[PDB]
mmCIF file of all heavy atoms in Angstrom:
data_model
loop_
_atom_site.group_PDB
_atom_site.id
_atom_site.type_symbol
_atom_site.label_atom_id
_atom_site.label_comp_id
_atom_site.label_asym_id
_atom_site.label_seq_id
_atom_site.Cartn_x
_atom_site.Cartn_y
_atom_site.Cartn_z
ATOM 1 N N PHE A 72 -17.918 36.477 19.111
ATOM 2 C CA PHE A 72 -16.847 36.648 20.084
ATOM 3 C C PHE A 72 -16.515 35.273 20.656
ATOM 4 O O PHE A 72 -17.404 34.558 21.124
ATOM 5 C CB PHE A 72 -17.263 37.619 21.199
ATOM 6 C CG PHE A 72 -16.316 37.644 22.374
ATOM 7 C CD1 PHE A 72 -15.145 38.400 22.330
ATOM 8 C CD2 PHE A 72 -16.598 36.915 23.527
ATOM 9 C CE1 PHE A 72 -14.268 38.422 23.416
ATOM 10 C CE2 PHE A 72 -15.729 36.932 24.617
ATOM 11 C CZ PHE A 72 -14.562 37.687 24.560
ATOM 12 N N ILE A 73 -15.240 34.900 20.606
ATOM 13 C CA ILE A 73 -14.792 33.624 21.158
ATOM 14 C C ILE A 73 -14.652 33.729 22.674
ATOM 15 O O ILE A 73 -13.754 34.406 23.185
ATOM 16 C CB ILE A 73 -13.470 33.135 20.512
ATOM 17 C CG1 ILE A 73 -13.677 32.839 19.022
ATOM 18 C CG2 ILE A 73 -12.941 31.897 21.238
ATOM 19 C CD1 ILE A 73 -12.389 32.620 18.241
ATOM 20 N N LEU A 74 -15.558 33.060 23.380
ATOM 21 C CA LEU A 74 -15.581 33.079 24.839
ATOM 22 C C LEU A 74 -15.031 31.773 25.424
ATOM 23 O O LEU A 74 -15.642 30.711 25.260
ATOM 24 C CB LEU A 74 -17.006 33.354 25.344
ATOM 25 C CG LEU A 74 -17.303 33.412 26.849
ATOM 26 C CD1 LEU A 74 -16.439 34.437 27.568
ATOM 27 C CD2 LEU A 74 -18.772 33.710 27.076
ATOM 28 N N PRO A 75 -13.869 31.847 26.105
ATOM 29 C CA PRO A 75 -13.271 30.677 26.751
ATOM 30 C C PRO A 75 -14.011 30.315 28.036
ATOM 31 O O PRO A 75 -14.026 31.103 28.983
ATOM 32 C CB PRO A 75 -11.837 31.132 27.069
ATOM 33 C CG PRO A 75 -11.683 32.502 26.464
ATOM 34 C CD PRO A 75 -13.052 33.057 26.306
ATOM 35 N N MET A 76 -14.615 29.129 28.054
ATOM 36 C CA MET A 76 -15.424 28.659 29.182
ATOM 37 C C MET A 76 -14.619 28.392 30.454
ATOM 38 O O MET A 76 -15.087 28.678 31.556
ATOM 39 C CB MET A 76 -16.171 27.375 28.807
ATOM 40 C CG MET A 76 -17.259 27.527 27.756
ATOM 41 S SD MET A 76 -17.903 25.917 27.244
ATOM 42 C CE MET A 76 -18.884 25.458 28.669
ATOM 43 N N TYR A 77 -13.420 27.834 30.294
ATOM 44 C CA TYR A 77 -12.638 27.343 31.431
ATOM 45 C C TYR A 77 -11.508 28.278 31.869
ATOM 46 O O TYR A 77 -10.533 27.837 32.486
ATOM 47 C CB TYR A 77 -12.090 25.940 31.137
ATOM 48 C CG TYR A 77 -13.153 24.896 30.862
ATOM 49 C CD1 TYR A 77 -13.101 24.108 29.715
ATOM 50 C CD2 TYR A 77 -14.212 24.698 31.748
ATOM 51 C CE1 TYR A 77 -14.074 23.144 29.462
ATOM 52 C CE2 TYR A 77 -15.191 23.741 31.500
ATOM 53 C CZ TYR A 77 -15.116 22.970 30.356
ATOM 54 O OH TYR A 77 -16.082 22.023 30.111
ATOM 55 N N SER A 78 -11.648 29.563 31.561
ATOM 56 C CA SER A 78 -10.653 30.566 31.935
ATOM 57 C C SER A 78 -10.593 30.750 33.449
ATOM 58 O O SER A 78 -11.624 30.894 34.110
ATOM 59 C CB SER A 78 -10.954 31.903 31.258
ATOM 60 O OG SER A 78 -9.968 32.869 31.584
ATOM 61 N N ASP A 79 -9.375 30.743 33.984
ATOM 62 C CA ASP A 79 -9.144 30.899 35.419
ATOM 63 C C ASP A 79 -8.988 32.365 35.838
ATOM 64 O O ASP A 79 -8.857 32.666 37.028
ATOM 65 C CB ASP A 79 -7.922 30.078 35.860
ATOM 66 C CG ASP A 79 -6.649 30.445 35.098
ATOM 67 O OD1 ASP A 79 -6.740 30.943 33.952
ATOM 68 O OD2 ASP A 79 -5.550 30.227 35.647
ATOM 69 N N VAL A 80 -9.013 33.268 34.860
ATOM 70 C CA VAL A 80 -8.807 34.700 35.110
ATOM 71 C C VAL A 80 -10.001 35.564 34.680
ATOM 72 O O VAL A 80 -9.978 36.789 34.831
ATOM 73 C CB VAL A 80 -7.503 35.223 34.444
ATOM 74 C CG1 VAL A 80 -6.272 34.626 35.118
ATOM 75 C CG2 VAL A 80 -7.503 34.935 32.948
ATOM 76 N N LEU A 81 -11.036 34.923 34.145
ATOM 77 C CA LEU A 81 -12.245 35.631 33.737
ATOM 78 C C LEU A 81 -13.448 35.234 34.585
ATOM 79 O O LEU A 81 -13.709 34.047 34.802
ATOM 80 C CB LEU A 81 -12.549 35.402 32.251
ATOM 81 C CG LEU A 81 -11.521 35.829 31.194
ATOM 82 C CD1 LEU A 81 -11.943 35.320 29.826
ATOM 83 C CD2 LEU A 81 -11.304 37.341 31.164
ATOM 84 N N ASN A 82 -14.165 36.243 35.069
ATOM 85 C CA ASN A 82 -15.430 36.041 35.758
ATOM 86 C C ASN A 82 -16.556 36.201 34.743
ATOM 87 O O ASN A 82 -16.858 37.313 34.307
ATOM 88 C CB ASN A 82 -15.578 37.042 36.914
ATOM 89 C CG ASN A 82 -16.748 36.719 37.837
ATOM 90 O OD1 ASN A 82 -17.842 36.371 37.389
ATOM 91 N ND2 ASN A 82 -16.521 36.854 39.137
ATOM 92 N N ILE A 83 -17.158 35.079 34.357
ATOM 93 C CA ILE A 83 -18.217 35.076 33.351
ATOM 94 C C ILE A 83 -19.586 34.968 34.022
ATOM 95 O O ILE A 83 -19.943 33.929 34.577
ATOM 96 C CB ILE A 83 -18.019 33.948 32.303
ATOM 97 C CG1 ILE A 83 -16.613 34.031 31.692
ATOM 98 C CG2 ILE A 83 -19.086 34.030 31.213
ATOM 99 C CD1 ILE A 83 -16.130 32.744 31.050
ATOM 100 N N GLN A 84 -20.337 36.063 33.967
ATOM 101 C CA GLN A 84 -21.650 36.155 34.592
ATOM 102 C C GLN A 84 -22.746 36.169 33.526
ATOM 103 O O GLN A 84 -22.573 36.757 32.456
ATOM 104 C CB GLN A 84 -21.723 37.416 35.460
ATOM 105 C CG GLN A 84 -22.977 37.548 36.324
ATOM 106 C CD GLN A 84 -23.021 38.847 37.123
ATOM 107 O OE1 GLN A 84 -22.003 39.520 37.302
ATOM 108 N NE2 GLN A 84 -24.205 39.196 37.613
ATOM 109 N N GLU A 85 -23.860 35.504 33.817
ATOM 110 C CA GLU A 85 -25.038 35.562 32.962
ATOM 111 C C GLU A 85 -25.981 36.642 33.480
ATOM 112 O O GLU A 85 -26.572 36.502 34.552
ATOM 113 C CB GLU A 85 -25.753 34.207 32.907
ATOM 114 C CG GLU A 85 -25.019 33.132 32.113
ATOM 115 C CD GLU A 85 -25.882 31.911 31.826
ATOM 116 O OE1 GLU A 85 -27.098 32.068 31.582
ATOM 117 O OE2 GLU A 85 -25.341 30.786 31.835
ATOM 118 N N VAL A 86 -26.090 37.731 32.724
ATOM 119 C CA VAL A 86 -26.961 38.846 33.081
ATOM 120 C C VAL A 86 -28.006 39.006 31.985
ATOM 121 O O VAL A 86 -27.684 39.409 30.865
ATOM 122 C CB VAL A 86 -26.171 40.169 33.269
ATOM 123 C CG1 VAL A 86 -27.108 41.316 33.640
ATOM 124 C CG2 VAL A 86 -25.093 40.007 34.331
ATOM 125 N N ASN A 87 -29.253 38.680 32.322
ATOM 126 C CA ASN A 87 -30.361 38.654 31.362
ATOM 127 C C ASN A 87 -30.031 37.810 30.123
ATOM 128 O O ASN A 87 -29.847 36.597 30.233
ATOM 129 C CB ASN A 87 -30.811 40.077 30.992
ATOM 130 C CG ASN A 87 -31.296 40.872 32.196
ATOM 131 O OD1 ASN A 87 -32.113 40.396 32.986
ATOM 132 N ND2 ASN A 87 -30.801 42.094 32.334
ATOM 133 N N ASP A 88 -29.944 38.452 28.958
ATOM 134 C CA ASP A 88 -29.591 37.763 27.715
ATOM 135 C C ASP A 88 -28.155 38.074 27.286
ATOM 136 O O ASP A 88 -27.796 37.940 26.112
ATOM 137 C CB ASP A 88 -30.587 38.119 26.605
ATOM 138 C CG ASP A 88 -32.017 37.735 26.954
ATOM 139 O OD1 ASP A 88 -32.234 36.621 27.480
ATOM 140 O OD2 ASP A 88 -32.928 38.549 26.696
ATOM 141 N N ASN A 89 -27.340 38.482 28.255
ATOM 142 C CA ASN A 89 -25.946 38.839 28.014
ATOM 143 C C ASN A 89 -24.961 38.003 28.824
ATOM 144 O O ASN A 89 -25.308 37.449 29.871
ATOM 145 C CB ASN A 89 -25.715 40.324 28.327
ATOM 146 C CG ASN A 89 -26.148 41.242 27.197
ATOM 147 O OD1 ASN A 89 -27.216 41.070 26.607
ATOM 148 N ND2 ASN A 89 -25.320 42.236 26.898
ATOM 149 N N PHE A 90 -23.733 37.911 28.319
ATOM 150 C CA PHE A 90 -22.602 37.452 29.111
ATOM 151 C C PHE A 90 -21.830 38.673 29.596
ATOM 152 O O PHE A 90 -21.420 39.516 28.794
ATOM 153 C CB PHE A 90 -21.675 36.542 28.299
ATOM 154 C CG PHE A 90 -22.210 35.151 28.081
ATOM 155 C CD1 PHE A 90 -22.299 34.625 26.796
ATOM 156 C CD2 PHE A 90 -22.616 34.362 29.156
ATOM 157 C CE1 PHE A 90 -22.785 33.339 26.581
ATOM 158 C CE2 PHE A 90 -23.106 33.074 28.952
ATOM 159 C CZ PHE A 90 -23.191 32.561 27.663
ATOM 160 N N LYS A 91 -21.655 38.770 30.908
ATOM 161 C CA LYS A 91 -20.841 39.818 31.509
ATOM 162 C C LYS A 91 -19.497 39.226 31.922
ATOM 163 O O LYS A 91 -19.442 38.268 32.698
ATOM 164 C CB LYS A 91 -21.561 40.431 32.714
ATOM 165 C CG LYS A 91 -20.834 41.600 33.367
ATOM 166 C CD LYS A 91 -21.664 42.184 34.498
ATOM 167 C CE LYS A 91 -20.864 43.176 35.319
ATOM 168 N NZ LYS A 91 -21.696 43.812 36.383
ATOM 169 N N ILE A 92 -18.419 39.800 31.393
ATOM 170 C CA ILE A 92 -17.069 39.308 31.657
ATOM 171 C C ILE A 92 -16.270 40.317 32.482
ATOM 172 O O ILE A 92 -16.038 41.445 32.042
ATOM 173 C CB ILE A 92 -16.309 38.982 30.348
ATOM 174 C CG1 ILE A 92 -17.145 38.054 29.458
ATOM 175 C CG2 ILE A 92 -14.942 38.363 30.655
ATOM 176 C CD1 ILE A 92 -16.727 38.058 28.003
ATOM 177 N N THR A 93 -15.865 39.900 33.680
ATOM 178 C CA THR A 93 -15.029 40.722 34.550
ATOM 179 C C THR A 93 -13.622 40.132 34.625
ATOM 180 O O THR A 93 -13.448 38.945 34.917
ATOM 181 C CB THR A 93 -15.629 40.854 35.972
ATOM 182 O OG1 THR A 93 -17.004 41.245 35.879
ATOM 183 C CG2 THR A 93 -14.868 41.895 36.792
ATOM 184 N N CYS A 94 -12.630 40.975 34.355
ATOM 185 C CA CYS A 94 -11.229 40.564 34.328
ATOM 186 C C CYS A 94 -10.542 40.805 35.677
ATOM 187 O O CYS A 94 -11.147 41.375 36.594
ATOM 188 C CB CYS A 94 -10.499 41.299 33.202
ATOM 189 S SG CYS A 94 -11.285 41.136 31.579
ATOM 190 N N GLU A 95 -9.291 40.356 35.789
ATOM 191 C CA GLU A 95 -8.492 40.517 37.008
ATOM 192 C C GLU A 95 -8.253 41.984 37.355
ATOM 193 O O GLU A 95 -8.245 42.356 38.530
ATOM 194 C CB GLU A 95 -7.146 39.799 36.877
ATOM 195 C CG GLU A 95 -7.214 38.283 37.016
ATOM 196 C CD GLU A 95 -5.839 37.631 37.057
ATOM 197 O OE1 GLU A 95 -4.938 38.067 36.307
ATOM 198 O OE2 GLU A 95 -5.662 36.673 37.839
#
Side-chain angles (χ1 to χ4, degrees):
Chain A
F72 169 82
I73 295 169
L74 179 56
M76 292 172 74
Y77 300 128
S78 182
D79 57 335
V80 292
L81 300 172
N82 191 317
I83 307 159
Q84 188 182 343
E85 288 192 37
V86 180
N87 300 311
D88 300 317
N89 279 44
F90 285 127
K91 184 177 170 177
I92 308 160
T93 310
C94 307
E95 284 187 321

